[PDB]
Amino acid sequence: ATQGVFTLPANTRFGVTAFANSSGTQTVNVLVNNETAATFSGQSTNNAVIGTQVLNSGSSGKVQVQVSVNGRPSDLVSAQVILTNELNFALVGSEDGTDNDYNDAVVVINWPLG
Ligand SMILES: *C(=O)C[C@@H]1O[C@@H](C)[C@@H](O)[C@@H](O)[C@@H]1O
Ligand SMILES: [Ca+2]
Ligand SMILES: [Ca+2]
Ligand SMILES: [Ca+2]
């Protein structure tokens, strides 16, 4: 199935944060209105926070996460979790290789803010 795609409430602020756990340099693209709105990059095997940003979910609310390592797209896994009918997490893991730990870039989207 498609992974890394989340429908947020439209025109709404959200946080997006990426962590790295791989020998390979991660490039994380966050898309709003179907175009890259933020790019994070780094190289860490100790969960470095390679980027964090506040974005707006855009006209449709559709937010997409894509991850690449040396120009090759990583395989994604994702889910959305809601606590007390109010607090939202959109979660992405990604795999750049063969060990299937899916932590090579980890992305956490959260809303509402403020
Ligand atoms: C290459 O070594 C594979 C790569 O980096 C490792 C250190 C480990 O984090 C693995 O999950 C990642 O795919
Ligand atoms: Ca891996
Ligand atoms: Ca890893
Ligand atoms: Ca608050």
Side-chain angles (χ1 to χ4, degrees), residues 1-71 73-114:
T2 294
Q3 298 281 265
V5 175
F6 311 100
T7 298
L8 276 61
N11 197 31
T12 296
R13 295 201 307 155
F14 64 98
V16 58
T17 303
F19 311 81
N21 291 283
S22 174
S23 65
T25 296
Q26 309 291 307
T27 298
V28 173
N29 294 308
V30 186
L31 289 75
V32 169
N33 304 318
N34 289 309
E35 65 187 20
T36 301
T39 303
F40 308 140
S41 184
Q43 191 278 305
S44 172
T45 48
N46 199 43
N47 212 45
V49 188
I50 56 168
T52 188
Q53 185 56 268
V54 173
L55 294 174
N56 184 293
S57 67
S59 296
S60 75
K62 179 186 153 184
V63 178
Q64 191 171 355
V65 176
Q66 293 175 168
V67 182
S68 65
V69 177
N70 62 252
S74 301
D75 189 52
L76 306 179
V77 294
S78 61
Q80 181 183 340
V81 187
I82 311 178
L83 305 186
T84 193
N85 198 39
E86 169 61 25
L87 171 64
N88 287 258
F89 298 89
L91 307 166
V92 181
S94 67
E95 180 50 53
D96 63 37
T98 60
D99 66 342
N100 297 327
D101 62 356
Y102 279 83
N103 72 357
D104 298 328
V106 177
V107 183
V108 175
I109 285 157
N110 64 291
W111 76 96
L113 303 189

XYZ file of all heavy atoms in Angstrom, unseen atoms left out:
837
model
N 0.818 -1.213 0.000
C 0.000 0.000 0.000
C 0.850 1.260 0.000
O 2.017 1.238 0.394
C -0.928 0.014 1.200
N 0.236 2.367 -0.418
C 0.864 3.672 -0.273
C 1.157 3.932 1.196
O 0.342 3.625 2.073
C -0.051 4.765 -0.832
O -0.188 4.590 -2.247
C 0.514 6.154 -0.549
N 2.342 4.474 1.458
C 2.765 4.811 2.804
C 3.319 6.229 2.802
O 3.733 6.753 1.763
C 3.815 3.815 3.319
C 3.309 2.372 3.412
C 2.465 2.128 4.658
O 2.973 1.676 5.690
N 1.172 2.435 4.570
N 3.318 6.853 3.977
C 3.873 8.188 4.106
C 2.963 9.301 3.638
O 3.424 10.438 3.488
N 1.687 9.011 3.397
C 0.716 10.008 2.962
C -0.352 10.135 4.037
O -0.937 9.129 4.459
C 0.091 9.624 1.609
C -1.012 10.609 1.234
C 1.164 9.570 0.541
N -0.621 11.371 4.468
C -1.567 11.614 5.546
C -2.480 12.768 5.172
O -2.009 13.793 4.672
C -0.849 11.954 6.852
C 0.260 11.001 7.203
C 1.580 11.318 6.943
C -0.028 9.776 7.785
C 2.613 10.445 7.285
C 0.995 8.899 8.125
C 2.313 9.232 7.869
N -3.777 12.612 5.433
C -4.724 13.707 5.248
C -4.901 14.423 6.585
O -5.530 13.896 7.514
C -6.060 13.202 4.705
O -5.859 12.596 3.416
C -7.020 14.368 4.556
N -4.341 15.600 6.684
C -4.553 16.438 7.845
C -5.755 17.331 7.605
O -6.222 17.464 6.466
C -3.311 17.295 8.104
C -2.181 16.654 8.910
C -1.592 15.410 8.236
C -1.102 17.698 9.176
N -6.291 17.956 8.652
C -7.225 19.060 8.425
C -6.555 20.091 7.535
O -5.357 20.357 7.660
C -7.501 19.599 9.834
C -6.411 19.052 10.692
C -6.007 17.754 10.086
N -7.323 20.628 6.595
C -6.763 21.525 5.601
C -6.306 22.826 6.251
O -6.877 23.282 7.247
C -7.796 21.813 4.513
N -5.241 23.406 5.688
C -4.814 24.766 6.041
C -4.471 24.882 7.526
O -4.758 25.894 8.175
C -5.891 25.782 5.648
C -5.368 27.198 5.608
O -4.200 27.423 5.307
N -6.230 28.163 5.927
N -3.860 23.835 8.067
C -3.603 23.709 9.495
C -2.109 23.544 9.752
O -1.409 22.853 9.000
C -4.390 22.506 10.056
O -5.795 22.762 9.921
C -4.076 22.265 11.530
N -1.619 24.172 10.818
C -0.208 24.042 11.169
C 0.094 22.657 11.732
O -0.695 22.088 12.492
C 0.189 25.096 12.202
C 0.107 26.527 11.703
C 0.984 27.451 12.550
N 0.703 27.329 13.981
C 1.578 27.625 14.939
N 2.797 28.052 14.620
N 1.241 27.490 16.216
N 1.263 22.131 11.382
C 1.729 20.889 11.978
C 3.237 20.946 12.147
O 3.938 21.698 11.466
C 1.326 19.662 11.139
C 1.956 19.615 9.765
C 3.094 18.850 9.530
C 1.389 20.313 8.703
C 3.672 18.793 8.261
C 1.955 20.263 7.427
C 3.103 19.493 7.206
N 3.733 20.138 13.075
C 5.164 19.969 13.256
C 5.629 18.741 12.494
O 4.901 17.755 12.388
N 6.837 18.815 11.949
C 7.438 17.651 11.308
C 8.896 17.606 11.728
O 9.589 18.625 11.687
C 7.279 17.674 9.771
C 7.915 18.940 9.153
C 7.862 16.387 9.168
N 9.347 16.431 12.164
C 10.668 16.247 12.747
C 11.241 14.941 12.223
O 10.523 13.939 12.148
C 10.585 16.230 14.288
O 9.980 17.444 14.749
C 11.959 16.096 14.924
N 12.525 14.944 11.866
C 13.165 13.750 11.320
C 14.391 13.356 12.136
O 15.161 14.213 12.584
C 13.572 13.952 9.853
N 14.565 12.046 12.308
C 15.679 11.446 13.035
C 16.419 10.492 12.110
O 15.792 9.797 11.305
C 15.197 10.660 14.271
C 14.226 11.412 15.146
C 12.877 11.480 14.821
C 14.664 12.036 16.309
C 11.976 12.174 15.637
C 13.778 12.729 17.130
C 12.430 12.795 16.798
N 17.744 10.407 12.252
C 18.542 9.525 11.403
C 19.178 8.392 12.205
O 19.675 8.607 13.314
C 19.637 10.318 10.671
N 19.171 7.174 11.622
C 19.766 5.966 12.221
C 20.310 5.057 11.112
O 19.774 3.975 10.853
C 18.749 5.204 13.077
C 18.373 5.955 14.343
O 19.131 5.984 15.311
N 17.196 6.562 14.342
N 21.395 5.487 10.460
C 21.912 4.742 9.319
C 23.315 5.228 8.979
O 23.653 6.394 9.199
C 21.006 4.905 8.096
O 21.589 4.287 6.966
N 24.116 4.334 8.408
C 25.398 4.786 7.887
C 25.226 5.705 6.685
O 26.138 6.479 6.376
C 26.270 3.592 7.509
O 25.692 2.882 6.437
N 24.084 5.639 6.003
C 23.867 6.437 4.805
C 23.267 7.792 5.141
O 22.452 7.917 6.050
N 23.692 8.811 4.399
C 23.122 10.139 4.572
C 21.668 10.143 4.117
O 21.364 9.751 2.985
C 23.939 11.167 3.784
O 25.256 11.230 4.335
C 23.306 12.544 3.848
N 20.773 10.572 5.008
C 19.340 10.583 4.731
C 18.931 11.925 4.156
O 19.437 12.968 4.571
C 18.525 10.316 6.000
C 18.960 9.083 6.769
C 18.639 7.813 6.007
O 17.489 7.594 5.591
N 19.653 6.973 5.798
N 18.020 11.891 3.191
C 17.365 13.091 2.684
C 15.870 12.875 2.815
O 15.323 11.937 2.224
C 17.731 13.365 1.227
O 19.138 13.598 1.127
C 16.987 14.607 0.733
N 15.218 13.727 3.590
C 13.800 13.611 3.895
C 13.106 14.800 3.257
O 13.419 15.954 3.580
C 13.540 13.597 5.410
C 12.039 13.648 5.686
C 14.209 12.385 6.080
N 12.157 14.531 2.372
C 11.353 15.568 1.743
C 9.933 15.503 2.283
O 9.337 14.421 2.351
C 11.345 15.414 0.226
C 12.705 15.647 -0.376
O 13.340 16.665 -0.108
N 13.179 14.693 -1.171
N 9.401 16.658 2.675
C 8.033 16.770 3.164
C 7.262 17.595 2.149
O 7.636 18.739 1.863
C 7.972 17.410 4.560
C 6.555 17.377 5.098
C 8.915 16.673 5.504
N 6.200 17.016 1.599
C 5.430 17.627 0.522
C 4.101 18.141 1.046
O 3.390 17.421 1.753
C 5.165 16.628 -0.608
C 6.343 16.212 -1.481
C 7.264 15.244 -0.769
C 5.792 15.593 -2.741
N 3.776 19.386 0.686
C 2.466 19.996 0.891
C 2.057 20.624 -0.439
O 2.910 21.133 -1.175
C 2.507 21.059 2.011
C 1.224 21.872 2.023
C 2.739 20.399 3.357
N 0.761 20.565 -0.761
C 0.274 20.955 -2.086
C 1.048 20.215 -3.180
O 1.360 20.774 -4.230
C 0.360 22.475 -2.304
C -0.383 23.276 -1.233
O -1.488 22.918 -0.813
N 0.225 24.373 -0.796
N 1.418 18.962 -2.899
C 2.058 18.084 -3.885
C 3.415 18.613 -4.362
O 3.822 18.362 -5.499
C 1.138 17.847 -5.087
C -0.040 16.978 -4.753
O 0.111 15.897 -4.185
N -1.232 17.445 -5.103
N 4.143 19.329 -3.510
C 5.480 19.801 -3.860
C 6.314 19.860 -2.592
O 5.782 19.964 -1.483
C 5.442 21.174 -4.540
C 4.929 22.284 -3.634
C 4.721 23.607 -4.362
O 4.610 23.607 -5.609
O 4.657 24.651 -3.677
N 7.630 19.797 -2.762
C 8.515 19.761 -1.602
C 8.445 21.080 -0.849
O 8.727 22.144 -1.415
C 9.949 19.464 -2.021
O 9.986 18.201 -2.689
C 10.844 19.392 -0.795
N 8.082 21.002 0.431
C 7.990 22.163 1.306
C 9.110 22.240 2.326
O 9.408 23.333 2.813
C 6.654 22.165 2.057
N 9.721 21.112 2.670
C 10.871 21.070 3.553
C 11.745 19.894 3.152
O 11.249 18.861 2.696
C 10.465 20.941 5.023
N 13.053 20.072 3.313
C 14.037 19.017 3.099
C 14.979 18.979 4.288
O 15.582 19.997 4.640
C 14.820 19.238 1.808
O 13.900 19.317 0.715
C 15.805 18.097 1.574
N 15.101 17.816 4.911
C 16.023 17.618 6.017
C 17.078 16.606 5.594
O 16.798 15.684 4.827
C 15.306 17.092 7.262
C 14.116 17.900 7.689
C 12.972 17.267 8.150
C 14.145 19.289 7.660
C 11.868 18.000 8.565
C 13.048 20.025 8.078
C 11.909 19.382 8.527
N 18.295 16.761 6.102
C 19.337 15.805 5.748
C 20.370 15.721 6.863
O 20.624 16.701 7.568
C 19.999 16.186 4.418
O 20.952 15.219 4.019
N 20.940 14.530 7.028
C 22.036 14.335 7.961
C 22.492 12.893 7.917
O 21.971 12.074 7.159
N 23.481 12.581 8.745
C 23.986 11.214 8.825
C 24.324 10.906 10.273
O 25.272 11.464 10.832
C 25.199 11.014 7.918
C 25.596 9.549 7.763
C 26.435 9.067 8.932
O 27.463 9.659 9.250
N 25.985 8.008 9.595
N 23.569 9.990 10.862
C 23.736 9.633 12.258
C 23.308 8.184 12.426
O 22.354 7.744 11.778
C 22.883 10.534 13.157
O 22.896 10.089 14.502
N 24.021 7.442 13.279
C 23.512 6.173 13.787
C 23.112 6.279 15.255
O 23.063 5.267 15.968
C 24.527 5.041 13.569
O 25.831 5.445 13.996
C 24.602 4.662 12.098
N 22.772 7.494 15.712
C 22.403 7.717 17.100
C 21.226 8.682 17.207
O 21.151 9.471 18.152
C 23.600 8.230 17.907
C 23.413 8.050 19.399
O 22.939 7.004 19.852
N 23.775 9.069 20.174
N 20.305 8.636 16.239
C 19.002 9.299 16.336
C 19.100 10.823 16.279
O 18.272 11.509 16.876
C 18.259 8.885 17.614
C 16.764 8.872 17.426
O 16.273 8.364 16.427
N 16.034 9.446 18.376
N 20.084 11.372 15.568
C 20.182 12.826 15.490
C 18.916 13.426 14.892
O 18.316 12.865 13.970
C 21.398 13.238 14.656
N 18.507 14.581 15.426
C 17.339 15.291 14.914
C 17.809 16.159 13.756
O 18.185 17.326 13.940
C 16.653 16.127 16.013
C 15.351 16.694 15.488
C 16.434 15.287 17.270
N 17.813 15.579 12.552
C 18.419 16.249 11.412
C 17.572 17.406 10.917
O 18.079 18.259 10.188
C 18.692 15.222 10.298
C 17.398 14.498 9.919
C 19.745 14.230 10.753
C 17.524 13.677 8.633
N 16.302 17.472 11.298
C 15.523 18.662 10.999
C 14.207 18.662 11.739
O 13.686 17.610 12.132
N 13.676 19.869 11.924
C 12.342 20.049 12.488
C 11.806 21.379 11.978
O 12.571 22.334 11.789
C 12.368 19.989 14.027
O 11.030 19.973 14.550
C 13.151 21.157 14.622
N 10.498 21.430 11.732
C 9.910 22.597 11.091
C 8.418 22.610 11.380
O 7.811 21.565 11.632
C 10.174 22.574 9.577
C 9.714 23.810 8.809
C 10.310 25.092 9.346
O 9.719 25.752 10.206
N 11.485 25.459 8.843
N 7.838 23.806 11.359
C 6.392 23.976 11.406
C 5.923 24.332 10.003
O 6.388 25.315 9.416
C 5.977 25.053 12.416
C 4.484 25.328 12.306
C 6.334 24.619 13.819
N 5.010 23.530 9.465
C 4.484 23.717 8.122
C 2.970 23.857 8.181
O 2.347 23.699 9.231
C 4.869 22.545 7.208
C 6.363 22.394 6.915
C 6.620 21.123 6.118
C 6.918 23.618 6.183
N 2.380 24.174 7.035
C 0.932 24.250 6.887
C 0.487 23.141 5.941
O 1.127 22.910 4.910
C 0.508 25.630 6.361
C -1.004 25.790 6.278
O -1.658 25.140 5.477
N -1.554 26.672 7.098
N -0.611 22.461 6.294
C -1.054 21.271 5.569
C -1.615 21.563 4.181
O -1.858 20.616 3.424
C -2.119 20.531 6.381
O -3.291 21.318 6.464
N -1.851 22.822 3.831
C -2.207 23.166 2.466
C -3.683 23.029 2.146
O -4.525 22.704 2.992
N -3.985 23.284 0.862
C -5.360 23.357 0.376
C -6.156 22.111 0.731
O -7.295 22.194 1.204
C -5.351 23.548 -1.145
O -4.754 24.777 -1.502
N -5.580 20.943 0.472
C -6.279 19.680 0.661
C -5.971 19.006 1.992
O -6.641 18.027 2.339
C -5.918 18.713 -0.465
O -4.612 18.220 -0.255
N -4.976 19.483 2.732
C -4.510 18.801 3.922
C -3.575 17.641 3.667
O -3.050 17.070 4.628
N -3.328 17.285 2.411
C -2.536 16.097 2.110
C -1.057 16.385 2.351
O -0.470 17.260 1.705
C -2.785 15.662 0.668
C -2.004 14.436 0.217
C -2.219 14.188 -1.282
C -1.034 13.464 -1.911
N -1.191 13.290 -3.386
N -0.449 15.645 3.272
C 0.973 15.768 3.570
C 1.649 14.457 3.195
O 1.149 13.376 3.538
C 1.220 16.102 5.054
C 2.715 16.180 5.349
C 0.534 17.407 5.423
N 2.780 14.549 2.496
C 3.503 13.366 2.048
C 4.958 13.435 2.481
O 5.592 14.488 2.398
C 3.435 13.207 0.528
C 3.947 11.851 0.068
C 3.707 11.578 -1.400
O 3.064 12.369 -2.105
N 4.194 10.426 -1.864
N 5.490 12.300 2.931
C 6.889 12.177 3.323
C 7.575 11.249 2.332
O 7.071 10.157 2.050
C 7.018 11.633 4.756
C 8.484 11.403 5.131
C 6.339 12.568 5.730
N 8.722 11.666 1.813
C 9.537 10.810 0.961
C 10.971 10.840 1.469
O 11.455 11.886 1.905
C 9.463 11.263 -0.511
C 8.084 11.070 -1.134
C 7.968 11.617 -2.551
O 6.993 11.345 -3.255
N 8.953 12.396 -2.970
N 11.644 9.691 1.436
C 13.004 9.566 1.946
C 13.869 8.961 0.853
O 13.448 8.028 0.160
C 13.067 8.697 3.223
C 14.491 8.625 3.748
C 12.130 9.237 4.301
N 15.071 9.500 0.686
C 16.027 8.930 -0.245
C 17.406 8.912 0.393
O 17.712 9.707 1.289
C 16.068 9.700 -1.565
O 16.535 11.010 -1.355
N 18.220 7.967 -0.062
C 19.597 7.813 0.375
C 20.430 7.620 -0.878
O 20.177 6.684 -1.649
C 19.776 6.629 1.339
C 21.245 6.469 1.712
C 18.923 6.826 2.569
N 21.402 8.508 -1.084
C 22.211 8.580 -2.302
C 21.349 8.435 -3.556
O 21.665 7.691 -4.486
C 23.354 7.557 -2.277
C 22.876 6.117 -2.220
O 23.005 5.450 -1.193
N 22.335 5.624 -3.329
N 20.243 9.177 -3.575
C 19.382 9.239 -4.737
C 18.482 8.040 -4.951
O 17.788 7.987 -5.972
N 18.476 7.070 -4.040
C 17.587 5.924 -4.163
C 16.454 6.044 -3.159
O 16.722 6.276 -1.974
C 18.358 4.620 -3.929
C 17.485 3.376 -3.898
N 15.193 5.907 -3.573
C 14.082 6.052 -2.619
C 14.066 4.910 -1.612
O 14.200 3.741 -1.977
C 12.833 6.027 -3.512
C 13.342 6.343 -4.901
C 14.719 5.753 -4.957
N 13.907 5.258 -0.342
C 13.756 4.253 0.700
C 12.329 3.716 0.746
O 11.370 4.385 0.355
C 14.109 4.843 2.065
O 15.435 5.324 2.069
N 12.195 2.484 1.224
C 10.874 1.908 1.442
C 10.292 2.465 2.733
O 10.998 2.584 3.734
C 10.980 0.385 1.507
C 9.633 -0.302 1.510
O 8.821 -0.006 0.613
O 9.409 -1.148 2.406
N 9.001 2.804 2.713
C 8.353 3.480 3.829
C 7.329 2.589 4.527
O 6.692 1.729 3.907
C 7.645 4.754 3.359
C 8.499 5.758 2.589
C 7.651 6.951 2.164
C 9.680 6.204 3.419
N 7.179 2.810 5.839
C 6.056 2.306 6.622
C 5.494 3.473 7.410
O 6.229 4.394 7.775
C 6.433 1.165 7.586
C 6.839 -0.034 6.816
C 7.543 1.598 8.547
N 4.186 3.438 7.668
C 3.555 4.600 8.285
C 2.240 4.223 8.958
O 1.643 3.172 8.687
C 3.328 5.714 7.251
O 2.462 5.279 6.210
N 1.797 5.114 9.846
C 0.502 5.004 10.506
C 0.189 6.338 11.165
O 1.083 7.151 11.413
C 0.486 3.880 11.547
N -1.093 6.555 11.450
C -1.524 7.714 12.219
C -2.170 7.225 13.508
O -2.936 6.255 13.499
C -2.498 8.586 11.412
C -2.982 9.831 12.149
C -4.001 10.613 11.343
O -4.086 10.452 10.127
N -4.771 11.476 12.012
N -1.843 7.886 14.618
C -2.374 7.550 15.933
C -3.003 8.798 16.532
O -2.451 9.898 16.415
C -1.275 7.001 16.864
C -1.878 6.510 18.158
C -0.517 5.876 16.178
N -4.157 8.633 17.179
C -4.854 9.745 17.818
C -5.107 9.403 19.278
O -5.724 8.376 19.582
C -6.185 10.077 17.120
C -5.979 10.192 15.614
C -6.757 11.360 17.688
C -7.263 10.470 14.841
N -4.667 10.282 20.177
C -4.852 10.107 21.611
C -5.914 11.070 22.125
O -5.954 12.239 21.721
C -3.547 10.317 22.377
C -2.371 9.448 21.923
C -1.181 9.639 22.859
C -2.778 7.989 21.836
N -6.751 10.559 23.032
C -7.917 11.218 23.616
C -8.677 12.058 22.590
O -9.143 13.164 22.880
C -7.523 12.029 24.871
O -8.707 12.414 25.581
C -6.657 13.276 24.571
N -8.830 11.506 21.384
C -9.666 12.070 20.332
C -9.242 13.479 19.947
O -10.067 14.266 19.475
C -11.140 12.066 20.756
C -12.085 12.210 19.592
O -11.862 11.637 18.513
N -13.155 12.973 19.797
N -7.964 13.805 20.139
C -7.522 15.186 20.071
C -6.092 15.344 19.566
O -5.812 16.243 18.764
C -7.659 15.811 21.454
C -6.977 17.182 21.598
C -7.574 18.187 20.652
O -8.765 17.976 20.271
O -6.896 19.163 20.290
N -5.169 14.520 20.045
C -3.749 14.708 19.767
C -3.326 13.727 18.679
O -3.488 12.519 18.845
C -2.924 14.504 21.040
C -1.410 14.450 20.850
C -0.880 15.775 20.337
C -0.735 14.048 22.162
N -2.773 14.242 17.581
C -2.521 13.446 16.387
C -1.030 13.264 16.150
O -0.265 14.234 16.185
C -3.139 14.093 15.150
C -4.643 13.965 15.123
O -5.191 13.125 14.411
N -5.321 14.794 15.899
N -0.636 12.030 15.850
C 0.704 11.700 15.384
C 0.599 11.023 14.027
O -0.182 10.080 13.861
C 1.419 10.748 16.339
C 1.632 11.296 17.714
C 0.667 11.134 18.699
C 2.824 11.932 18.039
C 0.869 11.616 19.981
C 3.035 12.422 19.318
C 2.058 12.258 20.295
N 1.399 11.476 13.074
C 1.611 10.745 11.832
C 3.057 10.279 11.829
O 3.976 11.095 11.978
C 1.293 11.606 10.610
N 3.255 8.970 11.696
C 4.535 8.329 11.961
C 5.051 7.652 10.703
O 4.297 6.967 10.008
C 4.397 7.291 13.073
C 3.751 7.842 14.340
C 3.355 6.680 15.233
C 4.690 8.820 15.041
N 6.335 7.836 10.408
C 6.952 7.239 9.227
C 8.260 6.582 9.636
O 9.083 7.201 10.322
C 7.221 8.282 8.123
C 7.851 7.615 6.890
C 5.947 9.049 7.745
N 8.459 5.343 9.195
C 9.775 4.742 9.227
C 10.254 4.487 7.815
O 9.443 4.443 6.884
N 11.554 4.322 7.623
C 12.050 4.144 6.267
C 13.253 3.219 6.301
O 13.973 3.158 7.298
C 12.394 5.487 5.624
O 13.495 6.126 6.249
N 13.465 2.502 5.198
C 14.493 1.467 5.114
C 15.318 1.705 3.862
O 14.769 1.713 2.752
C 13.858 0.069 5.082
C 14.865 -1.086 4.994
C 15.977 -0.967 6.027
O 15.655 -0.832 7.228
O 17.161 -0.987 5.634
N 16.626 1.887 4.035
C 17.517 2.142 2.910
C 18.323 0.920 2.499
O 19.135 1.013 1.569
C 18.461 3.322 3.227
C 19.406 3.057 4.408
O 19.901 1.923 4.579
O 19.689 4.018 5.153
N 18.111 -0.221 3.147
C 18.965 -1.389 2.953
C 18.229 -2.685 3.188
O 17.061 -2.826 2.798
N 18.906 -3.642 3.828
C 18.424 -5.014 3.893
C 18.137 -5.527 5.295
O 17.637 -6.651 5.420
C 19.432 -5.969 3.231
O 20.694 -5.890 3.907
C 19.626 -5.611 1.775
N 18.433 -4.766 6.350
C 18.218 -5.276 7.700
C 16.797 -5.067 8.199
O 16.435 -5.619 9.244
C 19.222 -4.655 8.681
C 19.045 -3.170 8.865
O 18.395 -2.507 8.024
O 19.602 -2.670 9.861
N 15.994 -4.292 7.474
C 14.580 -4.100 7.783
C 14.361 -3.578 9.200
O 13.396 -3.951 9.867
C 13.802 -5.390 7.544
C 13.851 -5.803 6.101
O 13.886 -4.949 5.212
N 13.904 -7.099 5.852
N 15.235 -2.678 9.664
C 14.916 -2.017 10.920
C 14.010 -0.805 10.736
O 13.356 -0.396 11.703
C 16.192 -1.667 11.728
C 17.152 -0.687 11.033
O 16.944 -0.285 9.876
O 18.156 -0.319 11.692
N 13.894 -0.277 9.509
C 12.953 0.804 9.174
C 13.106 2.027 10.074
O 12.167 2.803 10.253
C 11.501 0.292 9.159
C 11.241 -0.398 7.841
C 11.618 -1.715 7.652
C 10.687 0.289 6.767
C 11.432 -2.343 6.432
C 10.487 -0.331 5.544
C 10.873 -1.648 5.382
O 10.692 -2.272 4.167
N 14.309 2.245 10.607
C 14.575 3.430 11.416
C 15.574 4.362 10.751
O 16.029 5.318 11.384
C 15.086 3.034 12.806
C 16.503 2.494 12.773
O 17.099 2.357 11.709
N 17.060 2.202 13.950
N 15.932 4.090 9.491
C 17.066 4.772 8.874
C 16.814 6.267 8.771
O 17.708 7.074 9.050
C 17.354 4.144 7.508
C 17.744 2.683 7.622
O 18.360 2.306 8.646
O 17.419 1.898 6.706
N 15.596 6.649 8.400
C 15.051 7.958 8.732
C 13.686 7.724 9.352
O 12.876 6.957 8.809
C 14.934 8.875 7.513
N 13.464 8.330 10.512
C 12.193 8.275 11.223
C 11.612 9.675 11.181
O 12.323 10.652 11.453
C 12.374 7.794 12.676
C 11.050 7.819 13.431
C 12.978 6.381 12.717
N 10.339 9.788 10.810
C 9.681 11.088 10.724
C 8.430 11.068 11.590
O 7.633 10.120 11.529
C 9.344 11.455 9.270
C 8.733 12.852 9.211
C 10.604 11.368 8.382
N 8.260 12.118 12.392
C 7.117 12.284 13.273
C 6.458 13.606 12.913
O 7.112 14.653 12.940
C 7.533 12.272 14.753
C 6.325 12.573 15.647
C 8.182 10.940 15.125
N 5.180 13.544 12.551
C 4.337 14.710 12.301
C 3.340 14.801 13.452
O 2.759 13.785 13.844
C 3.625 14.569 10.942
C 4.615 14.818 9.798
C 2.390 15.460 10.857
C 4.210 14.195 8.455
N 3.178 15.991 14.032
C 2.223 16.109 15.132
C 1.370 17.355 14.961
O 1.825 18.381 14.448
C 2.899 16.103 16.527
C 3.809 17.299 16.755
O 4.865 17.425 16.132
N 3.406 18.177 17.666
N 0.106 17.234 15.363
C -0.801 18.375 15.392
C -1.931 18.058 16.362
O -2.115 16.896 16.742
C -1.342 18.687 13.987
C -2.414 17.757 13.482
C -3.767 17.945 13.548
C -2.217 16.508 12.798
N -4.424 16.891 12.955
C -3.497 15.995 12.488
C -1.086 15.771 12.428
C -3.676 14.781 11.828
C -1.265 14.556 11.772
C -2.552 14.081 11.473
N -2.683 19.074 16.822
C -2.505 20.509 16.566
C -1.338 21.076 17.354
O -0.836 20.451 18.292
C -3.829 21.112 17.041
C -4.221 20.235 18.175
C -3.779 18.829 17.776
N -0.914 22.268 16.960
C 0.152 22.995 17.629
C -0.438 24.109 18.477
O -1.638 24.390 18.433
C 1.127 23.589 16.613
C 1.795 22.610 15.654
C 2.893 23.313 14.851
C 2.356 21.421 16.434
N 0.433 24.753 19.246
C 0.076 25.987 19.936
C -0.515 25.806 21.316
O -0.936 24.714 21.703
C 24.520 -0.023 5.863
O 25.375 -0.284 6.685
C 23.042 -0.176 6.225
C 22.508 0.908 7.085
O 23.347 1.523 8.070
C 23.506 0.611 9.205
C 24.510 1.192 10.204
C 22.131 0.307 9.875
O 21.611 1.515 10.466
C 21.143 -0.101 8.791
O 19.834 -0.151 9.403
C 21.092 0.862 7.632
O 20.175 0.344 6.634
Ca 17.989 -0.180 7.741
Ca 19.119 1.717 10.793
Ca -1.335 23.739 23.943
